[PDB]
Amino acid sequence: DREALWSKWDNASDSQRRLAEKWLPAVQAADEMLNQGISTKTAFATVAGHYQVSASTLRDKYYQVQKFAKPDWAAALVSEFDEDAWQFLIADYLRPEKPAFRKCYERLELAAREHGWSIPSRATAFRRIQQLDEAMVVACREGEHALMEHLDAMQWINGDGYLHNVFVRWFNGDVIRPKTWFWQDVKTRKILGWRCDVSENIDSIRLSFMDVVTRYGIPEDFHITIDNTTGGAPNRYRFKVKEDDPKGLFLLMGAKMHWLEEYVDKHPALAGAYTGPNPQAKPDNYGDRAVDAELFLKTLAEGVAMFNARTGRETEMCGGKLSFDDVFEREYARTIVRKPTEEQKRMLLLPAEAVNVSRKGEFTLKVGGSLKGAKNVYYNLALMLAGVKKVVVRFDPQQLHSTVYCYTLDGRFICEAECLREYRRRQKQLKSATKAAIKAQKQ
DNA sequence: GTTTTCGCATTTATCGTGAAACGCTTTCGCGTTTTTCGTGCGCCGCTTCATCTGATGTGTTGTTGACG
DNA sequence: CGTCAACAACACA
DNA sequence: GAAGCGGCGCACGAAAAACGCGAAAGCGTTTCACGATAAATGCGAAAAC
């Protein structure tokens, strides 16, 4: 078997291979002289004469390589210690603690002393630690497991969210860190739409999508991706909105569902609000520094515009020359899209949590929050004329004073109905009664 | 009686054989050689300490209140 | 007095 | 303002592949003997001219 021999040739150093290379023409030339029947003496004297080599060495090596085939002649020319201590050390390093090697080793020395174990050299120990596995380190921290056709413009869009590090004073006066959801065209990388709000919830996604399909339309083959590899909650309209299934609406749009920090967060105008990744940051300065919602949102819109308009984008489509806007304007004109009807757009208007319907076929929504306070009562004959107890109300905040649309709890449209700080005081009082009691318990 | 051929003897030559000697190449044998491989320690440079740590959304269950 | 329905908390992803 | 852990480079020593000197055995071609046989030459005698 020439496998072990050739692996020995292979594993040899460059210097060793060079040595074999140097020794090969001398052995081969020698073979020629003997074939001619030249005296061994004259042949070796001649080779040792022309080539600087010991005649005896050449002779000996020739006989050694004689038994080997000629193509392989080159390849021819080329810790006992206590397992308990070793196990103890390995056991120690693999702990999530992951102590320093030299110190863990010293501890091991103490244990070895107590048990009388014969330990190997620190260098040997660590060497063997390297020899263990890439997987073992992960075994200690569970780390690696945490890592592990033609596309038209508008054909495939990706949705992503972003939590801002900038403090903004919102429309309701509260100072918060806004969260914005963005829709991006996968091919051209152009941002097609966005919506910003006080927290992460479906509304910003839904409405940014609405912005995207209203502005650019709905393609005939529509793919949407949100990599997850429901929001709702009370009551910005004083009535709760909403536990639903957005999923159905997306599938209905004819969409197949799949599962700037420099421009916004780092813009000069917000410098008092953005703190930066500062581990130590004084909280005493910031209540005054929080920027206005209008300024933040304007800076955001301009940041998006500048991100899209930025040339020198290194992508296939831009070829290091054009901007996302250029390639989007170019490719969008080569795709076939359809505009959404008024009805479709209205079906996307916001869902209110189920309200009770009386025997008379009327129900109530207590309007408030960002809208003018009022207790709206809606009515229709179809509500009293068939089976219903609870009903989901779909509405446009701007049209609450006139027409809403009632749906059954399972989603079937029934008919439309015509129209015939509050809880924050409790929230604040609760806050004070917390803080005072908390300080009193701390002391 | 003179010459020539014919029969017998001794000496030398050579073969066929068998065990044998030399000379060439081939190996292995052992003393002294040469490289590679581990074990081992010491030094240098980088980085943290001079003050550091936990959540959210939705569903289900339990308890309590209201209603029959 | 008994049962049912809703609200609130805790646990889970 | 201070110190430790990690990582890398240099040296020692020892074992395993090695090297140069040999040397003997394997082995081929050649060796010598030894001896025996023929055959080639030696001599003489008898027949021949």
mmCIF file of N, CA and C in Angstrom, chain A residues 88 103-117 119:
data_model
loop_
_atom_site.group_PDB
_atom_site.id
_atom_site.type_symbol
_atom_site.label_atom_id
_atom_site.label_comp_id
_atom_site.label_asym_id
_atom_site.label_seq_id
_atom_site.Cartn_x
_atom_site.Cartn_y
_atom_site.Cartn_z
ATOM 1 N N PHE A 88 -11.027 16.333 36.338
ATOM 2 C CA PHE A 88 -11.337 17.408 37.279
ATOM 3 C C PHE A 88 -11.171 18.762 36.574
ATOM 4 N N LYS A 103 -5.124 29.831 36.840
ATOM 5 C CA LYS A 103 -5.673 29.769 38.193
ATOM 6 C C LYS A 103 -6.450 28.448 38.409
ATOM 7 N N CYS A 104 -7.275 28.065 37.441
ATOM 8 C CA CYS A 104 -8.036 26.814 37.522
ATOM 9 C C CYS A 104 -7.005 25.690 37.676
ATOM 10 N N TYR A 105 -5.881 25.842 36.976
ATOM 11 C CA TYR A 105 -4.768 24.904 37.044
ATOM 12 C C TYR A 105 -4.179 24.876 38.447
ATOM 13 N N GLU A 106 -4.006 26.046 39.059
ATOM 14 C CA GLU A 106 -3.453 26.116 40.414
ATOM 15 C C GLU A 106 -4.384 25.380 41.396
ATOM 16 N N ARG A 107 -5.687 25.560 41.206
ATOM 17 C CA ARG A 107 -6.679 24.908 42.054
ATOM 18 C C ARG A 107 -6.542 23.405 41.887
ATOM 19 N N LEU A 108 -6.338 23.014 40.634
ATOM 20 C CA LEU A 108 -6.147 21.621 40.289
ATOM 21 C C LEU A 108 -4.904 21.103 41.001
ATOM 22 N N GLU A 109 -3.872 21.939 41.113
ATOM 23 C CA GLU A 109 -2.646 21.565 41.816
ATOM 24 C C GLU A 109 -2.944 21.283 43.286
ATOM 25 N N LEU A 110 -3.800 22.102 43.900
ATOM 26 C CA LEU A 110 -4.190 21.885 45.302
ATOM 27 C C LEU A 110 -4.916 20.548 45.453
ATOM 28 N N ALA A 111 -5.835 20.274 44.527
ATOM 29 C CA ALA A 111 -6.590 19.024 44.575
ATOM 30 C C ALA A 111 -5.640 17.853 44.353
ATOM 31 N N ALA A 112 -4.741 18.002 43.388
ATOM 32 C CA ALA A 112 -3.727 17.006 43.066
ATOM 33 C C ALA A 112 -2.854 16.740 44.280
ATOM 34 N N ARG A 113 -2.597 17.788 45.057
ATOM 35 C CA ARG A 113 -1.787 17.695 46.264
ATOM 36 C C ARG A 113 -2.540 16.840 47.272
ATOM 37 N N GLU A 114 -3.819 17.158 47.457
ATOM 38 C CA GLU A 114 -4.681 16.474 48.418
ATOM 39 C C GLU A 114 -4.833 14.983 48.063
ATOM 40 N N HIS A 115 -5.010 14.699 46.773
ATOM 41 C CA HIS A 115 -5.172 13.338 46.255
ATOM 42 C C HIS A 115 -3.858 12.685 45.798
ATOM 43 N N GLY A 116 -2.782 13.468 45.749
ATOM 44 C CA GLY A 116 -1.481 12.993 45.297
ATOM 45 C C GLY A 116 -1.372 12.733 43.800
ATOM 46 N N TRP A 117 -2.151 13.460 42.998
ATOM 47 C CA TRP A 117 -2.147 13.271 41.543
ATOM 48 C C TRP A 117 -0.897 13.828 40.866
ATOM 49 N N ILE A 119 0.274 15.666 37.828
ATOM 50 C CA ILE A 119 -0.249 16.492 36.744
ATOM 51 C C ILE A 119 0.770 16.776 35.627
#
